[PDB]
Amino acid sequence: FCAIL
Amino acid sequence: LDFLRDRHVRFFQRCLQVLPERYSSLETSRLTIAFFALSGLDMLDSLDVVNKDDIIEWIYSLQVLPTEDRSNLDRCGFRGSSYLGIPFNPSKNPGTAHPYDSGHIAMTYTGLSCLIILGDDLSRVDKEACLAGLRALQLEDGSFCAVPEGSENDMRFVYCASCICYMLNNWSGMDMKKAISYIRRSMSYDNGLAQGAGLESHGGSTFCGIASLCLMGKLEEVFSEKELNRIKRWCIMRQQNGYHGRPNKPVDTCYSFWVGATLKLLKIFQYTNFEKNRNYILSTQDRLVGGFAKWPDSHPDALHAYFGICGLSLMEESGICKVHPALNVSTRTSERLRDLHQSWKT
Amino acid sequence: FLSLDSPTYVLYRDRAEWADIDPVPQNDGPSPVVQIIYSEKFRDVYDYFRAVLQRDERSERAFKLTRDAIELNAANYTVWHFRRVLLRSLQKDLQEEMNYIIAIIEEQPKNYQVWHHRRVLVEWLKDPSQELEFIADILNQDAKNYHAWQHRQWVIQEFRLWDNELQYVDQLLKEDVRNNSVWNQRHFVISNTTGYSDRAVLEREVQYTLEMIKLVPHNESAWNYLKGILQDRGLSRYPNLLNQLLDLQPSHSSPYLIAFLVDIYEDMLENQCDNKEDILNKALELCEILAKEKDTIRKEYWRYIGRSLQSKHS
Ligand SMILES: CC(C)=CCC/C(C)=C/CC/C(C)=C/CCN(C)CCOP(=O)(O)OP(=O)(O)O
Ligand SMILES: [Cl-]
Ligand SMILES: [Zn+2]
Looking at the domain covering C1-314, what would its CATH class be? Predict the structure, then answer.
């Protein structure tokens, strides 16, 4: 997996 | 099955040490990886396995301090890592001018957060510079950007801004009225909160919105009882066994925290099914290397390891500290922060 | 030009064109934390990137260097910013950059920096002609890609391209009526064009949704849309809705329908309706049906809801 940036 | 606590402690320990070249895409977000690991160890009450002093110096070496002429105030805060090549300086000497060196809102957030977790008192943090940098990031619509040079803007950064103001115990870092407006406008017809007005409501943005309001202590003031009931409904409908971030989407371990924490803030997490949630989270536990993955039989990472643990924490897992659902640190750390704020007020 | 995997690739430290530049290394101090190990090539490209970046060199060689830095790590937001600075300084062909970013996004559709870059380009060109089709392609690899929908809404709003979206929505809903992103898009289009205050439109929409519900009764998205477009006008203000739903209960039942009914009844109690005490029981009866057999996983929630209706109308 989860690219939160 | 059961919670392999020691395995997870080693997992976080390794993260603080070295990462495979396959994490290169996290270079500019290394400070958040440090946060996942540090806060993760804190949550497992194992911060003793690391050298707090070394790490604190590293963190301070990431602070973008104002230069002699203080002409870069709008760019102060923290860097995600040393990727720009600026000479190691643990917030000792003044700022060394650089055309592209600026802070990143998510790094200023996780940075301060890490410092508090490690016991530092933030005395070496140029609070005013950070707040000045924060203000500069807010847009006309109330939301925030991550960096002064420009970036996308949404609820994620509104939450970061809120956490920063809260930890520095000074809300001059934002125009709270505009921020609240942005948060309200993000509510969807289905009653969840989206990244921005008109967008699809999402568990991640709902957490950011609700948590931000709670941090400002204005949840009750911003949403009516009828509104809060609708939001609660949307949130609790996210549980399938574990939690998903949007209707008709597969569950993902990290949502056990994103949504779970929101439910906790809305005081109804107690009405969710603990067993199915716990079972799902554990099914994504890597019994060999430790940590958790988003899905079962999937590779683990720092983010899911941390959020899976916080998810378990929400249900008071045997062996895991209570997590502060709005600040995303252990209650123990949130308490130490309360003391810090009191001590300042003298 | 010279690809990173080309047999004839040469480290920047070994390139004549770069002899005049001293590479700038990255240093995490005495005790590195969360350090990522880098290959010779990787560190080489970035050691030179830091050098060029540090001197704010707006050169053509710097521009080419960003291509490599981006291939090594498209998540480095600073690299993209600098590349944009260069695009302007060197007055590069933005139409060419559009092809570049189009390829990049296809390979990394979940990267925040690449979508931001494309949005900036489109703003610069004031040209949205490629957008809707591009997004439709990306949405083909993942119909729920949040970045894609976010970009799509920005384009449509910024350049007022509403004319065909409602049709696009109808098409996608046929492909997968369970795609919550599409239902959101539908509400996006309508509320930004005709609005729902036009009773003709409201009826068309409520009718449309009931049709979709009849095709797949168990779909939270459809039910959320239905309740969404009516909850503020007042669910109880629609007498024929209550009955049309009660008629579905037999066959097309689902926890979503039961919940809707409970919400209708609650709206009634909220508006001092006729048979207050009787309605409240109709609700409670349903809350329990949800807790005991329809939506068991939320058993405690529903019971909590019931107790709330109890102490609120008695
Ligand atoms: C480091 C830290 C604790 C930051 C807090 C502030 C932030 C950045 C919160 C982000 C919350 C969040 C989960 C946002 C969604 C991220 N995505 C994965 C967006 C789009 O990709 P999709 O694959 O469509 O996502 P998904 O299907 O998981 O909803
Ligand atoms: Cl609770
Ligand atoms: Zn996840």
Answer: mainly alpha
